[PDB]
Amino acid sequence: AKRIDAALILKDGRVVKGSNFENLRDSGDPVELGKFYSEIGIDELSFWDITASVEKRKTMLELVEKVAEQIDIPITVGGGIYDFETASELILRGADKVEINTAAVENPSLITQIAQTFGSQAVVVYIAAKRVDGEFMVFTYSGTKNTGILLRDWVVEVEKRGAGEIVLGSIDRLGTKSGYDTEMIRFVRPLTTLPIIAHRGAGKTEHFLEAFLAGADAAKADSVFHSREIDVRELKEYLKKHGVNVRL
Numbered sequence: 001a002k003r004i005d006a007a008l009i010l011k012d013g014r015v016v017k018g019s020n021f022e023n024l025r026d027s028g029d030p031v032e033l034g035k036f037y038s039e040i041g042i043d044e045l046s047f048w049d050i051t052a053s054v055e056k057r058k059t060m061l062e063l064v065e066k067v068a069e070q071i072d073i074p075i076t077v078g079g080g081i082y083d084f085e086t087a088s089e090l091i092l093r094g095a096d097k098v099e100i101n102t103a104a105v106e107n108p109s110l111i112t113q114i115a116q117t118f119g120s121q122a123v124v125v126y127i128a129a130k131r132v133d134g135e136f137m138v139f140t141y142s143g144t145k146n147t148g149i150l151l152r153d154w155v156v157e158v159e160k161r162g163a164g165e166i167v168l169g170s171i172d173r174l175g176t177k178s179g180y181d182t183e184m185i186r187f188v189r190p191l192t193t194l195p196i197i198a199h200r201g202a203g204k205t206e207h208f209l210e211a212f213l214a215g216a217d218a219a220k221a222d223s224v225f226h227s228r229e230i231d232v233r234e235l236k237e238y239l240k241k242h243g244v245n246v247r248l
Helices: 030-040 056-070 084-093 102-106 109-118 151-161 182-191 205-213 232-241
Strands: 003-011 044-049 075-078 097-100 123-132 135-140 145-150 165-170 196-199 218-221
Touching: 003 030, 003 196, 003 232, 030 044, 030 056, 030 232, 044 056, 056 075, 056 084, 075 123, 084 097, 084 109, 097 102, 097 109, 102 109, 102 135, 102 145, 102 151, 109 123, 109 151, 123 151, 135 151, 145 151, 151 182, 165 182, 182 196, 182 205, 205 218, 205 232
Parallel strands: 003 044, 003 218, 044 075, 075 097, 097 123, 123 165, 165 196, 196 218
Antiparallel strands: 123 135, 135 145
């Protein structure tokens, strides 16, 4: 089935900018918010850490310990995971998947190291890409460094190295609400047999349909769900109505 994923951006243990769910005891608590999403029909969750402190490592491990106890859908953890030991720590603490991005681009061996022990199914590569002079290029350090590596080349290398899925984040859609970057999705689709997860640009229910027509296997969103602009259950009902194989 096509997957609907929610992502939660975290700093110092808190959901950055929080959420608009009034029913919740603490609307900026990542564990409670994650649990609520699992209950309404989210398929998988991403916890994306932007902490830099020096409590970052210990904070993420304590968060995944808690989440693993309370939430029973697949969990991905990401945000500055730079080496095998950090990834291993998180997986053994309860993360189903670890997401890497800057460290994977700089040291693609990391992909293979993790997959060698945990299987490719445990490895997510987030690829942040942008149009630069008519070429899709890969950006590292929170979308800030033009690595000079072509998206087309990196997608193939990521698969070769042993990643299990690719989150394709269009920097050209950061903060926008006009739709997923379906041109980018279509560009990548023929290049890899891996699951491709669309990220950035979702503003309304129909944008998810467009992403699936483009060949995405999953769609990730965050603020559009946290703001309550889109309701997860209404989204899945809509998608099912229009022939998309979602889990209901």
